[PDB]
Each structure stands twice: as C-alpha cells, then as structure tokens.
C-alpha cells in the first residue's frame, strides 16, 4: 500500500487471514507486536494521518492512534517532527506536554540511542524545551530503570561487541567475561538483522554513560540485583512463540551481554539462581541450545562460591536439569547431531561436578547422602521410570518419595513435578511383588503416605496409578490406618503452614507470592517478582516494622536484597455480593478482586488484582488472607466489607446446589480461618465472632451439606452457646466416633430403637424388629415393605447368613448383591462397568480368577481393580465408612496378588507368616475393617 486505494484492499484480507491461522485474536494484534518496524518506515518520511488504518482491522484513525501513540511519538520526536507531534496530540484531544510526559520513556531512550550514532540539535534539547530543565530532570529521575530496559531492547548483536568493552575505556571486564562465556560454548552462526530501530552495538557503553552523567549515578557501577532481574525479565518477556525460533536465539545473545556486562551481581544472589532456572527451558530446545549450554556452564563454573552455600536450590535444579537433558537425549539432521554431542559433554561435566560437591551448610549428614544418591542416580537414569529393585530409576524415585516426607527436605515442589513427570509418564510396574522396591508391609506402612500425595496430579500414567494403588492397599491392611490426607475436612492446617511463625495474613500472602517466583512460566514469575519488588521497596521506604518483620521471615535473604529498589526509584513499567453468584467457577476471583480494590493503602493488597486475575487457582488459595486483611484494615473506619459480606452470607449459606458446593467449602474455610485470628482489643476468644456476623445454625447446616462433620459439630456447639436438633442427627450419624450417636435425644418408639440397632449394626436383635416390620407391611399391602426388605438384606449381610440374604435378593442393593455372590461363589453375574462399589471390584477380580486359564489375565484384572479403586479414592467426597471400605478393598486385591505370585514352598510359608503378622494388628482393630 505504500493503486493505494485498491491494492490496500487485498492486503486487508491477507493480514486478516494471517491472524486466522496463527490464532491471534484479530489483526490489531499483528499491528501491536509489529509496531516499531511499521511506524519507523512510514513515519520516517510521511505523516501519521495518512497511515493505512483500515488494514489490521481498525475502525478509525484515532483508534490506531490511541493504541500506538507511545512508539509513534517516540519515532517522531527522534525525527525532529515537532508540529507532527502537535497535530497528533491535538488530534487525540490533549496537550503536547502531556503526550510527551506520558511517553517519556521511549522518547528519551530513542533520542539518546540515536543522536550519539549521528552527533547540532539533539532530541533531548527538545525535552528540555517542552518540559523545562527541571521537570525533565525529575522525569529522568523517575524513569531510570525503564530507560535502561529500553536501552537493552533496541540494540544489535550481529557485530563484534567485545571491541567496545575491551576498548581502552571505562570497563573491559565486560569484554573479558563475554569472551570467556563465548569460549565455554558458542553458536558460531548469525541471525537476520533485528527489527528496527536497532541501533549499533558499540554504544551501550556510551548510552549508559551519557544517561548516568545526566542524572548523577555511578555509571561505572549501576547494577544492583533489582535492576539485573528487572531487565532480564523484560528481555525474556519480549519473546513471543509466533515470532519464530531465531528470536529466542537473538534474545539469548542479548541476555549474555546483560550477564557479562552486569559483572558480579548476576552470578550470585537471587539473579544467579533465577537466571539458571530461566535458562532451563531454553536449554531443552533443538534450535537454540548451544548458547544456553554455554551460558549455563559459565554461570555454574563461575558462580560456584554461592552454589556451595545453597544445596537445596542446587539439588532441585540439578535434578530438574538432568531429567530434562535425559529426555532430550532420548528424543537438519546434521545440525541436530552436533547439538546432541555438545549436550552430552555438558551432561558429563555436570555429573563430574555434582560428584565433587561439598557444602559447608549441609545441615544433617543424612541429607548429604540423600543429595549424593539423588545426583548419582539422576545422572545414570533412562528416559522412563520403573519400580524394580536395584535399578537407577527406582532408587531415584524412592529417594524423592523418601525426602518428600521430612522436616529438612531438599527439593521444592516444581522440582518434584519435573522428576515425577519423567519417571511416571511411561511407568513400568513389576510383575511380581518380590521384585518391587516397596515389597514388605513394613516398608509400605512407612512409605505409604507420600505415595498418596504423589498420585494427586494428572501427568501420571496408568501403570503408575496401579503401582501406587498396590502399595496403599498393602499398607492399609498391615497398618490398620487410612492415609492422613484423605480424612481431612478443613484447610486450616494448610493456612497455618503458609503463615509459619506468626499468624498474620501478610506472611501468608508473601509465602504464596514467593512460591510463584519458582513455579512460573516466565510471565507468572514476572508478576510475582514485580509484586515482591514493590512490596519490599515500599517497606524499606515507609519503614513498616510489622511488614518488615513479615518480609524477613517469609523471603530468603537473596530474594530480599534483590527485591528492594533502594538505589533506583521504582519505574512506571509494573455483581459478586449477591446470591446466584456462588455458582460460577470464578466467584472467588471476582470477589477477591472486589475486596482487594477497596483497600489501596495496604500495599500487599494493592498488587494482587493482577495476580488474582491472571494466575489460575490463586484466588482460592489466597481468599482467606485477603478477607482477613481487608476486615482488619477497616476495623476502626467505616466497616463496609463486614456489612456486605455478613449480609450476603445469609443467602450464600442456605445454598443447596452441586455447582455451588466448591465455593461453599471456601466460605466455610474462611469462617474457620477468621476464628483463629486475634481481633485487636479483645478480652477473650469469644470476641472473634465479630469478624463477620454468621448465623451459626446456617453454617452448621451448610457444613453438613459439604460433608464437613467435625466442622459442622463445632458450628452447632457455637450456635447452642448463642442460644442459652434436626441437624444434630445428620452430624452424629456420620461423624467418626463409636459413642457420640448415643448422646442425642429423640422421641422413643419401636422404629427409633430399630434405627439405633441398624446404626449399631446389631445382628439378630435388628433382625427381630425388622422381621416384625416387614411382616406387618407385607400383610397390610404397604409400600414401605420394599425399604424393609432392603434393611433386612443389609442386616442379613452383616451377620454372615448369606443363603437367606440371597433368597431375599432373588425376590427383588449393589454391595449386598455382589458380597453375597462372592460368599456363595456364584461367578456368573454380569458385573457393571465403571462402578464406585468395592464389592463389584473385588467380585470382578475373583470372577476373572474363575474364568481364566492364564495368570496374566488375572493379573491384568487385579491391576485394573487397584487402578480404579485408587482413582475412586482421589475423587474426593467420601465419608469415613466408604473411605475405609475402599481402602480395605485395596488390601484384599493386594493379598490376592500376593498369593497369585508364589513360586515355591518357601514363598508360601512366608505368605502364611505375613498373615500371622497381620493378625497381631487385627486383634484390636476396627471390626468392619477386619
């Protein structure tokens, strides 16, 4: 387009289709991520009023103007087109000085990068003319860090760059270090010229010096860790998966320059660890690997004085990186081969290094051996994970699962989610149980709780679920006790773990955010680090002793020094309250934002709305801390959030629904959490009922709906205190205590005594009362006799009289049908598929054992049963009878699998001895489970 009237029509359809193929929501996107090069060539010689706005899918010239004004004004003021800027402004509708102060970052960055590549009138003199020699200095004082970011964005690398640094001028350590890095590894290739403006590369040492001289900083030393992390994250952010794989290689050149120019601040402290973690994803990339491997080897070899003070990060990163290099090795061609060789050399170097590693701050001597085992195994593993004894994958898996449960643990969560995703993607389950690594009951009771925490992700295959199931089942029987993860109702333990040390919501939010700087995707970590930098900066500024104390104890020391922007001031680059809103899956996120916006003076709530809206599942984890922070803030002021929340609770708690159950759990956990936070100016814990105004009878009913019986009982006791029995019956039938049910008073009759006898699981005593009812309802042609028959079958199944219950079933439950079938050995029932009953699962395994001629159809049916039962346990809402029954099923399938796999007489006798050993626990265990 640059006839023009008509040719620029076919270009409206192409750029329309280029979007419809690269999955970018419209062509205006393609104008946004290609703004500089488009404007730089057009505005170079023409106005901005004649721009072909109709392309890219705009509607009027002013919309493109409003979208691209910053880059537009930047280019114009680089080109001395003042009256152009004037017309641009007076076309937007505002004044030139405002439009020059809003877009001041790019403008100074460009007008400095350019006019030292030319060297008459400048582009800064116009800044001192439109703004005055004082507002200009104040602005250049506000936007320093942003200006350094923009200096690192618009600059080239297709050139000898180590000449300017090593040139006999200010700083040559930059070139020395750059040359060393490019010796430890280098892509000898070249790339296309970068998107303009792209000034030359022998100007960074001069642009920075000029700028510092204009604002009295130490141009010889400006790099604090805040600035290093800021700029490196800006760079890593600027990439885009659409712009092709040479873009990443280019940005890696720029990052190596930032490193070798940043001196020592970027090979120790938080920049070191963060940069390594970021260069993890780049390493496992076929197109851009050699540069990442060189930079990584440099950072590890040089920053080794620090990696000896930090064995936790080193262990986590070592495991993650050796796992990532293992899959890469397993998975034109000549170019690929060279990359594989270099990568294998790097892997060997890493193995030698880790084998020669000693840290003074290795706390216990056992941890040291755990580190040594993790490394010496991960260095030799294969691309898949198995469970057979003696092999490397199994030793590593067992070491991860063993470290998982401890007080001083090595790896962090994202460092387990990368090793447990390689060793469990294609898992290999041993045939027998004598080759397994968790083979004995003695070890399965110990390692039986972490295996359940392991199988709660979705990157785990089938064979791994079947193995985890075998072990859980084996442990249940020998231990006698269900895993402690399953039988937890409230989330208060997790909330208390977050705020470790003091019970404040600021420590909770700080730990939650600090948990994102390690578990992000180069965009989440960016928001987390920006939030931390603003929070710590404002704490060091306003000297909040409270907030400072919260920061010292939540953030480690490296992430604390780095977060404070002491040298450079922070640059400018960083209805729900009504019913029926409880049912959309974003209630918590909208309500949390709505609450956090109402308290701007709290810095910890001011930086949340971005993270609450972008990150997924963050609002549910941070909801109690946000509610408490707001309520505690406006305690003496006008209490608005209290009034709104306590008026809506009257409608939210009386909400029976399936889609609203998961937000109702979060409301109950927020009420429980507020009960543990001391209100200021209280005499007793009885005043913690004034955070909100909850009707405790409604909360007790709601907690009963969600399956929260101990929480429901606590709320029912608080309600009774407020007074001084239809919900107490539902609580007491289901709560897990043998004797509590009998404390409840209800009106007497033969029916109620029958109800108590059927709760009690009595034998002949309930058979008498049920027989009487059943006869009296068959005689009177009553319709309840059906239910009576059901009750009778249940009773007769709890006695052991299988023949009588069989005859009662054939006169027309699921558990009763298949329990009776299994006891009488009737192996021809058609068993339903995908059923949540344990009797069906156990029945199918024994049936298949009847109708089969080879052991490896029976083993497949057993393993399918373990896998299904394990999935069922993970499904969530189960009482403590169904839960215990399901775990018992697992124990029966495990014993079945144990006797199927005996080979000689000695194994038979060892099985028998195991039965005798198990008996010792059974003598005192619960009766249903025995």
Tab-separated table of C-alpha atoms in Angstrom, residues 242-659:
chain	number	residue	atom	x	y	z
A	242	UNK	CA	4.871	-16.715	16.978
A	243	UNK	CA	7.967	-14.747	16.033
A	244	UNK	CA	9.976	-17.864	15.264
A	245	UNK	CA	12.930	-19.681	16.783
A	246	UNK	CA	15.608	-17.214	15.731
A	247	UNK	CA	14.009	-14.659	18.038
A	248	UNK	CA	14.854	-16.750	21.082
A	249	UNK	CA	18.456	-17.141	19.928
A	250	UNK	CA	18.650	-13.363	19.495
A	251	UNK	CA	17.272	-12.648	22.954
A	252	UNK	CA	19.828	-15.122	24.297
A	253	UNK	CA	22.597	-13.072	22.724
A	254	UNK	CA	21.162	-10.016	24.461
A	255	UNK	CA	20.979	-11.862	27.778
A	256	UNK	CA	24.591	-12.962	27.530
A	257	UNK	CA	25.517	-9.323	27.028
A	258	UNK	CA	23.479	-8.331	30.078
A	259	UNK	CA	25.265	-11.018	32.081
A	260	UNK	CA	28.822	-10.239	31.019
A	261	UNK	CA	28.152	-6.522	31.451
A	262	UNK	CA	26.336	-6.900	34.785
A	263	UNK	CA	29.524	-8.029	36.465
A	264	UNK	CA	29.212	-9.993	39.663
A	265	UNK	CA	25.676	-9.115	40.732
A	266	UNK	CA	24.379	-11.605	38.156
A	267	UNK	CA	26.490	-14.586	39.195
A	268	UNK	CA	25.498	-14.594	42.850
A	269	UNK	CA	22.458	-13.988	44.964
A	270	UNK	CA	18.997	-14.270	43.520
A	271	UNK	CA	19.938	-13.273	39.957
A	272	UNK	CA	22.194	-16.326	39.695
A	273	UNK	CA	19.539	-18.854	40.715
A	274	UNK	CA	16.780	-17.135	38.782
A	275	UNK	CA	18.800	-16.879	35.588
A	276	UNK	CA	19.709	-20.565	35.741
A	277	UNK	CA	16.093	-21.548	36.302
A	278	UNK	CA	15.046	-19.419	33.338
A	279	UNK	CA	17.724	-20.885	31.084
A	280	UNK	CA	16.271	-24.311	31.853
A	281	UNK	CA	13.532	-24.110	29.186
A	282	UNK	CA	15.881	-22.597	26.616
A	283	UNK	CA	18.359	-25.440	27.119
A	284	UNK	CA	15.853	-28.062	26.033
A	285	UNK	CA	15.289	-26.538	22.615
A	286	UNK	CA	16.769	-28.043	19.443
A	287	UNK	CA	17.054	-24.778	17.542
A	288	UNK	CA	18.594	-22.672	20.349
A	289	UNK	CA	20.612	-24.902	22.678
A	290	UNK	CA	24.359	-24.354	22.304
A	291	UNK	CA	24.192	-20.774	23.563
A	292	UNK	CA	22.088	-21.841	26.551
A	293	UNK	CA	24.536	-24.621	27.392
A	294	UNK	CA	27.462	-22.217	27.170
A	295	UNK	CA	25.787	-19.628	29.377
A	296	UNK	CA	24.756	-22.301	31.859
A	297	UNK	CA	28.239	-23.772	32.110
A	298	UNK	CA	29.604	-20.278	32.643
A	299	UNK	CA	27.114	-19.438	35.369
A	300	UNK	CA	27.731	-22.690	37.210
A	301	UNK	CA	31.521	-22.696	36.895
A	302	UNK	CA	31.868	-19.039	37.884
A	303	UNK	CA	29.138	-18.683	40.465
A	304	UNK	CA	30.393	-21.677	42.433
A	305	UNK	CA	31.200	-19.817	45.646
A	306	UNK	CA	27.447	-19.316	46.032
A	307	UNK	CA	26.202	-22.748	44.922
A	308	UNK	CA	28.192	-24.074	47.885
A	309	UNK	CA	26.043	-22.078	50.334
A	310	UNK	CA	22.810	-23.365	48.763
A	311	UNK	CA	22.439	-27.115	48.368
A	312	UNK	CA	18.644	-27.009	48.278
A	313	UNK	CA	18.454	-24.956	45.096
A	314	UNK	CA	21.391	-26.849	43.665
A	315	UNK	CA	19.724	-30.204	44.295
A	316	UNK	CA	16.381	-29.123	42.882
A	317	UNK	CA	17.890	-27.534	39.802
A	318	UNK	CA	20.316	-30.399	39.272
A	319	UNK	CA	17.532	-32.960	39.327
A	320	UNK	CA	15.311	-30.909	37.029
A	321	UNK	CA	18.088	-30.241	34.549
A	322	UNK	CA	19.456	-33.778	34.413
A	323	UNK	CA	15.912	-35.056	33.884
A	324	UNK	CA	15.340	-32.529	31.101
A	325	UNK	CA	18.631	-33.470	29.452
A	326	UNK	CA	17.780	-37.158	29.691
A	327	UNK	CA	14.517	-36.892	27.750
A	328	UNK	CA	16.200	-34.597	25.225
A	329	UNK	CA	18.951	-37.144	24.560
A	330	UNK	CA	16.389	-39.918	24.074
A	331	UNK	CA	14.482	-37.774	21.583
A	332	UNK	CA	18.713	-30.584	9.535
A	333	UNK	CA	19.836	-33.910	10.967
A	334	UNK	CA	23.498	-32.896	10.837
A	335	UNK	CA	22.748	-29.779	12.868
A	336	UNK	CA	20.830	-31.858	15.407
A	337	UNK	CA	23.719	-34.303	15.852
A	338	UNK	CA	26.195	-31.553	16.775
A	339	UNK	CA	23.790	-30.211	19.388
A	340	UNK	CA	23.407	-33.673	20.916
A	341	UNK	CA	27.171	-34.085	21.222
A	342	UNK	CA	27.617	-30.717	22.920
A	343	UNK	CA	24.706	-31.507	25.240
A	344	UNK	CA	26.203	-34.870	26.183
A	345	UNK	CA	29.506	-33.189	27.013
A	346	UNK	CA	27.652	-30.707	29.215
A	347	UNK	CA	25.843	-33.561	30.948
A	348	UNK	CA	29.108	-35.365	31.657
A	349	UNK	CA	30.633	-32.172	33.046
A	350	UNK	CA	27.618	-31.682	35.302
A	351	UNK	CA	27.889	-35.237	36.581
A	352	UNK	CA	31.587	-34.805	37.400
A	353	UNK	CA	30.834	-31.515	39.168
A	354	UNK	CA	27.945	-32.856	41.252
A	355	UNK	CA	30.004	-35.876	42.244
A	356	UNK	CA	32.679	-33.478	43.532
A	357	UNK	CA	30.349	-31.170	45.521
A	358	UNK	CA	30.750	-30.163	49.178
A	359	UNK	CA	28.669	-27.581	51.008
A	360	UNK	CA	29.541	-26.188	54.453
A	361	UNK	CA	25.858	-25.521	55.126
A	362	UNK	CA	24.780	-29.113	54.691
A	363	UNK	CA	22.643	-29.363	57.805
A	364	UNK	CA	22.473	-33.060	58.676
A	365	UNK	CA	24.772	-35.800	57.427
A	366	UNK	CA	21.841	-37.860	56.160
A	367	UNK	CA	20.754	-35.058	53.839
A	368	UNK	CA	24.229	-35.124	52.309
A	369	UNK	CA	23.839	-38.807	51.485
A	370	UNK	CA	20.395	-38.063	50.071
A	371	UNK	CA	21.907	-35.392	47.832
A	372	UNK	CA	24.627	-37.786	46.710
A	373	UNK	CA	22.096	-40.511	45.921
A	374	UNK	CA	19.756	-38.185	44.021
A	375	UNK	CA	22.608	-36.924	41.875
A	376	UNK	CA	24.432	-40.213	41.279
A	377	UNK	CA	21.117	-41.761	40.221
A	378	UNK	CA	19.662	-38.961	38.100
A	379	UNK	CA	22.968	-38.902	36.259
A	380	UNK	CA	22.527	-42.500	35.045
A	381	UNK	CA	18.762	-42.969	34.637
A	382	UNK	CA	16.921	-43.821	31.435
A	383	UNK	CA	14.067	-41.917	29.806
A	384	UNK	CA	11.356	-43.921	31.613
A	385	UNK	CA	10.744	-44.918	35.213
A	386	UNK	CA	10.235	-48.348	36.721
A	387	UNK	CA	9.830	-49.873	40.174
A	388	UNK	CA	12.045	-52.986	40.064
A	389	UNK	CA	14.685	-53.181	42.769
A	390	UNK	CA	18.325	-52.320	42.188
A	391	UNK	CA	17.840	-50.195	39.076
A	392	UNK	CA	18.527	-46.469	38.984
A	393	UNK	CA	15.056	-45.110	38.193
A	394	UNK	CA	13.641	-46.918	41.219
A	395	UNK	CA	16.405	-45.726	43.543
A	396	UNK	CA	15.788	-42.160	42.407
A	397	UNK	CA	12.006	-42.435	42.755
A	398	UNK	CA	12.339	-43.921	46.207
A	399	UNK	CA	14.779	-41.197	47.206
A	400	UNK	CA	12.411	-38.462	46.040
A	401	UNK	CA	9.476	-40.064	47.840
A	402	UNK	CA	11.600	-40.575	50.940
A	403	UNK	CA	12.799	-36.970	51.025
A	404	UNK	CA	9.250	-35.770	50.434
A	405	UNK	CA	8.260	-36.623	53.987
A	406	UNK	CA	10.714	-34.897	56.327
A	407	UNK	CA	11.429	-31.681	58.213
A	408	UNK	CA	14.582	-30.621	56.311
A	409	UNK	CA	13.708	-31.528	52.738
A	410	UNK	CA	15.925	-30.950	49.729
A	411	UNK	CA	13.725	-30.411	46.689
A	412	UNK	CA	10.955	-27.893	46.163
A	413	UNK	CA	7.578	-28.667	44.623
A	414	UNK	CA	8.359	-27.662	40.998
A	415	UNK	CA	11.494	-29.785	41.276
A	416	UNK	CA	9.419	-32.839	42.123
A	417	UNK	CA	6.841	-32.073	39.439
A	418	UNK	CA	9.615	-32.433	36.851
A	419	UNK	CA	11.258	-35.634	38.064
A	420	UNK	CA	7.930	-37.302	38.898
A	421	UNK	CA	6.741	-36.426	35.401
A	422	UNK	CA	9.557	-38.281	33.634
A	423	UNK	CA	9.661	-41.300	35.944
A	424	UNK	CA	5.862	-41.648	35.768
A	425	UNK	CA	4.956	-40.758	32.188
A	426	UNK	CA	5.706	-44.281	30.999
A	427	UNK	CA	5.906	-46.289	34.211
A	428	UNK	CA	6.841	-49.975	34.313
A	429	UNK	CA	5.179	-51.955	37.111
A	430	UNK	CA	6.947	-55.182	38.120
A	431	UNK	CA	5.069	-58.417	37.505
A	432	UNK	CA	5.725	-59.888	40.937
A	433	UNK	CA	5.731	-58.198	44.320
A	434	UNK	CA	9.033	-59.711	45.452
A	435	UNK	CA	10.982	-57.670	42.898
A	436	UNK	CA	9.215	-54.414	43.776
A	437	UNK	CA	11.110	-51.784	45.720
A	438	UNK	CA	8.311	-51.326	48.274
A	439	UNK	CA	7.725	-55.035	48.834
A	440	UNK	CA	7.231	-55.649	52.553
A	441	UNK	CA	4.383	-54.372	54.694
A	442	UNK	CA	6.990	-52.867	56.999
A	443	UNK	CA	8.132	-50.508	54.259
A	444	UNK	CA	4.710	-49.887	52.742
A	445	UNK	CA	3.320	-48.565	56.024
A	446	UNK	CA	6.198	-46.116	56.200
A	447	UNK	CA	6.271	-45.037	52.545
A	448	UNK	CA	2.506	-45.258	52.239
A	449	UNK	CA	1.531	-41.665	52.931
A	450	UNK	CA	3.798	-39.904	50.439
A	451	UNK	CA	2.709	-42.244	47.668
A	452	UNK	CA	-0.814	-40.906	48.089
A	453	UNK	CA	0.424	-37.317	47.855
A	454	UNK	CA	2.266	-38.428	44.730
A	455	UNK	CA	-0.834	-39.713	42.937
A	456	UNK	CA	-2.728	-36.427	43.016
A	457	UNK	CA	-1.560	-34.957	39.692
A	458	UNK	CA	-2.677	-35.521	36.115
A	459	UNK	CA	0.640	-36.111	34.337
A	460	UNK	CA	0.763	-39.604	35.888
A	461	UNK	CA	0.039	-42.526	33.604
A	462	UNK	CA	-1.894	-45.690	34.311
A	463	UNK	CA	0.810	-48.129	35.352
A	464	UNK	CA	1.953	-45.663	37.994
A	465	UNK	CA	-1.526	-45.330	39.468
A	466	UNK	CA	-1.730	-49.113	39.613
A	467	UNK	CA	1.582	-49.296	41.483
A	468	UNK	CA	0.604	-46.566	43.950
A	469	UNK	CA	-2.608	-48.459	44.481
A	470	UNK	CA	-0.879	-51.737	45.192
A	471	UNK	CA	1.220	-50.089	47.875
A	472	UNK	CA	-1.624	-48.168	49.523
A	473	UNK	CA	-3.635	-51.359	49.681
A	474	UNK	CA	-0.780	-53.350	51.132
A	475	UNK	CA	-0.217	-50.721	53.801
A	476	UNK	CA	-3.870	-50.362	54.831
A	477	UNK	CA	-4.097	-53.981	55.927
A	478	UNK	CA	-0.765	-54.129	57.718
A	479	UNK	CA	-1.019	-50.645	59.221
A	480	UNK	CA	-4.676	-50.716	60.097
A	481	UNK	CA	-4.992	-46.969	59.471
A	482	UNK	CA	-6.095	-44.943	56.451
A	483	UNK	CA	-3.795	-42.263	54.946
A	484	UNK	CA	-3.976	-38.960	56.774
A	485	UNK	CA	-4.567	-36.988	53.579
A	486	UNK	CA	-7.991	-38.463	52.895
A	487	UNK	CA	-9.638	-37.757	56.247
A	488	UNK	CA	-9.143	-34.009	56.401
A	489	UNK	CA	-12.118	-31.694	56.100
A	490	UNK	CA	-10.878	-28.165	56.779
A	491	UNK	CA	-7.963	-26.462	55.077
A	492	UNK	CA	-6.880	-24.752	58.287
A	493	UNK	CA	-3.722	-26.827	58.518
A	494	UNK	CA	-2.598	-25.553	55.127
A	495	UNK	CA	-3.445	-21.965	56.012
A	496	UNK	CA	-1.439	-22.332	59.220
A	497	UNK	CA	1.511	-23.735	57.295
A	498	UNK	CA	1.514	-20.737	54.942
A	499	UNK	CA	1.743	-18.227	57.806
A	500	UNK	CA	4.541	-20.059	59.581
A	501	UNK	CA	5.987	-18.269	62.595
A	502	UNK	CA	3.205	-15.754	63.239
A	503	UNK	CA	-0.488	-15.812	62.499
A	504	UNK	CA	-0.711	-12.912	60.061
A	505	UNK	CA	-2.199	-12.632	56.606
A	506	UNK	CA	0.802	-10.700	55.296
A	507	UNK	CA	3.131	-13.651	55.812
A	508	UNK	CA	0.587	-15.816	54.073
A	509	UNK	CA	0.435	-13.628	51.016
A	510	UNK	CA	4.217	-13.249	50.969
A	511	UNK	CA	4.737	-17.010	51.062
A	512	UNK	CA	2.122	-17.529	48.373
A	513	UNK	CA	3.788	-14.998	46.079
A	514	UNK	CA	7.299	-16.245	46.846
A	515	UNK	CA	6.010	-19.635	45.776
A	516	UNK	CA	5.394	-18.263	42.274
A	517	UNK	CA	8.893	-16.983	41.554
A	518	UNK	CA	9.998	-20.634	41.240
A	519	UNK	CA	6.879	-22.197	39.668
A	520	UNK	CA	6.067	-19.876	36.791
A	521	UNK	CA	6.223	-19.615	33.026
A	522	UNK	CA	8.393	-16.523	32.509
A	523	UNK	CA	5.222	-14.468	32.815
A	524	UNK	CA	3.891	-15.551	36.179
A	525	UNK	CA	7.302	-15.289	37.789
A	526	UNK	CA	7.428	-11.803	36.315
A	527	UNK	CA	4.285	-10.701	38.117
A	528	UNK	CA	5.412	-12.362	41.340
A	529	UNK	CA	8.798	-10.652	41.269
A	530	UNK	CA	7.259	-7.290	40.400
A	531	UNK	CA	4.871	-7.620	43.328
A	532	UNK	CA	7.713	-8.559	45.672
A	533	UNK	CA	9.880	-5.685	44.471
A	534	UNK	CA	7.153	-3.123	45.018
A	535	UNK	CA	6.280	-4.540	48.442
A	536	UNK	CA	9.840	-4.685	49.756
A	537	UNK	CA	10.650	-1.293	48.235
A	538	UNK	CA	7.694	0.292	49.997
A	539	UNK	CA	8.597	-1.434	53.252
A	540	UNK	CA	12.141	-0.053	53.114
A	541	UNK	CA	10.678	3.354	52.250
A	542	UNK	CA	7.877	3.626	54.814
A	543	UNK	CA	9.765	1.556	57.427
A	544	UNK	CA	6.833	-0.616	58.448
A	545	UNK	CA	8.291	-2.667	61.292
A	546	UNK	CA	5.317	-5.031	61.044
A	547	UNK	CA	5.668	-5.545	57.303
A	548	UNK	CA	9.452	-5.664	57.537
A	549	UNK	CA	9.218	-8.404	60.152
A	550	UNK	CA	6.843	-10.281	57.875
A	551	UNK	CA	9.276	-9.922	54.967
A	552	UNK	CA	12.368	-11.061	56.866
A	553	UNK	CA	10.694	-14.338	57.827
A	554	UNK	CA	8.946	-15.207	54.555
A	555	UNK	CA	11.530	-14.280	51.890
A	556	UNK	CA	15.049	-15.724	51.987
A	557	UNK	CA	17.970	-13.321	52.113
A	558	UNK	CA	18.827	-13.319	48.371
A	559	UNK	CA	15.232	-12.683	47.360
A	560	UNK	CA	15.130	-9.940	49.997
A	561	UNK	CA	18.124	-7.834	48.959
A	562	UNK	CA	17.167	-8.180	45.308
A	563	UNK	CA	13.597	-7.093	45.893
A	564	UNK	CA	14.446	-3.673	47.355
A	565	UNK	CA	14.987	-0.854	44.834
A	566	UNK	CA	16.961	1.375	47.164
A	567	UNK	CA	19.352	2.906	44.594
A	568	UNK	CA	16.747	3.438	41.832
A	569	UNK	CA	13.164	4.557	42.437
A	570	UNK	CA	10.543	2.160	41.088
A	571	UNK	CA	9.825	2.889	37.398
A	572	UNK	CA	6.405	3.016	35.817
A	573	UNK	CA	6.527	-0.250	33.923
A	574	UNK	CA	4.954	-2.525	36.528
A	575	UNK	CA	-22.489	-8.459	40.951
A	576	UNK	CA	-20.383	-10.520	43.329
A	577	UNK	CA	-22.133	-9.535	46.549
A	578	UNK	CA	-25.392	-11.317	45.752
A	579	UNK	CA	-26.795	-14.824	45.638
A	580	UNK	CA	-26.668	-16.960	42.488
A	581	UNK	CA	-23.135	-15.647	42.127
A	582	UNK	CA	-21.889	-18.527	44.240
A	583	UNK	CA	-22.319	-20.821	41.238
A	584	UNK	CA	-19.982	-19.519	38.677
A	585	UNK	CA	-16.493	-21.017	38.855
A	586	UNK	CA	-14.887	-17.578	39.200
A	587	UNK	CA	-16.792	-16.335	42.242
A	588	UNK	CA	-13.700	-16.354	44.429
A	589	UNK	CA	-11.577	-14.474	41.900
A	590	UNK	CA	-14.142	-11.723	41.295
A	591	UNK	CA	-14.904	-11.343	44.979
A	592	UNK	CA	-11.225	-11.280	45.897
A	593	UNK	CA	-10.506	-8.519	43.386
A	594	UNK	CA	-13.560	-6.580	44.535
A	595	UNK	CA	-12.328	-6.749	48.124
A	596	UNK	CA	-8.676	-6.034	47.397
A	597	UNK	CA	-9.555	-2.927	45.407
A	598	UNK	CA	-11.343	-1.407	48.405
A	599	UNK	CA	-8.131	-1.085	50.465
A	600	UNK	CA	-5.475	0.741	48.445
A	601	UNK	CA	-3.422	1.827	51.454
A	602	UNK	CA	-2.339	-1.750	52.154
A	603	UNK	CA	0.499	-2.400	49.756
A	604	UNK	CA	0.047	-6.157	49.968
A	605	UNK	CA	-3.493	-5.901	48.613
A	606	UNK	CA	-2.707	-3.268	46.021
A	607	UNK	CA	-0.503	-5.586	43.947
A	608	UNK	CA	-2.896	-8.508	44.000
A	609	UNK	CA	-5.587	-7.841	41.351
A	610	UNK	CA	-3.164	-8.664	38.525
A	611	UNK	CA	-2.121	-11.973	40.067
A	612	UNK	CA	-5.669	-12.843	41.121
A	613	UNK	CA	-6.961	-12.386	37.579
A	614	UNK	CA	-4.116	-13.981	35.618
A	615	UNK	CA	-2.870	-16.928	37.670
A	616	UNK	CA	-5.272	-19.855	37.825
A	617	UNK	CA	-6.267	-21.265	41.183
A	618	UNK	CA	-4.584	-18.455	43.077
A	619	UNK	CA	-7.741	-16.781	44.323
A	620	UNK	CA	-8.919	-19.927	46.070
A	621	UNK	CA	-5.608	-20.253	47.895
A	622	UNK	CA	-5.448	-16.583	48.869
A	623	UNK	CA	-9.112	-15.917	49.647
A	624	UNK	CA	-8.925	-16.154	53.470
A	625	UNK	CA	-5.849	-13.977	53.677
A	626	UNK	CA	-7.461	-11.282	51.549
A	627	UNK	CA	-10.689	-11.274	53.550
A	628	UNK	CA	-8.822	-11.051	56.823
A	629	UNK	CA	-6.558	-8.265	55.600
A	630	UNK	CA	-9.482	-6.133	54.476
A	631	UNK	CA	-11.565	-6.747	57.583
A	632	UNK	CA	-8.603	-5.987	59.818
A	633	UNK	CA	-7.809	-2.826	57.896
A	634	UNK	CA	-11.213	-1.190	58.106
A	635	UNK	CA	-11.782	-2.142	61.738
A	636	UNK	CA	-11.944	1.372	63.174
A	637	UNK	CA	-13.041	3.065	59.939
A	638	UNK	CA	-16.449	2.528	58.358
A	639	UNK	CA	-16.897	-1.243	58.219
A	640	UNK	CA	-18.128	-1.784	54.673
A	641	UNK	CA	-16.743	-5.200	53.759
A	642	UNK	CA	-18.079	-6.592	57.031
A	643	UNK	CA	-21.559	-5.282	56.287
A	644	UNK	CA	-21.598	-6.554	52.715
A	645	UNK	CA	-20.173	-9.990	53.488
A	646	UNK	CA	-22.372	-10.538	56.516
A	647	UNK	CA	-25.467	-9.546	54.544
A	648	UNK	CA	-24.650	-11.876	51.673
A	649	UNK	CA	-23.768	-14.802	53.934
A	650	UNK	CA	-27.427	-15.056	54.912
A	651	UNK	CA	-28.087	-16.078	51.306
A	652	UNK	CA	-24.896	-17.950	50.480
A	653	UNK	CA	-25.011	-20.374	53.383
A	654	UNK	CA	-28.543	-21.544	52.539
A	655	UNK	CA	-27.489	-22.724	49.085
A	656	UNK	CA	-28.130	-26.337	48.114
A	657	UNK	CA	-26.511	-26.960	44.740
A	658	UNK	CA	-23.931	-29.102	43.034
A	659	UNK	CA	-22.077	-26.294	41.204
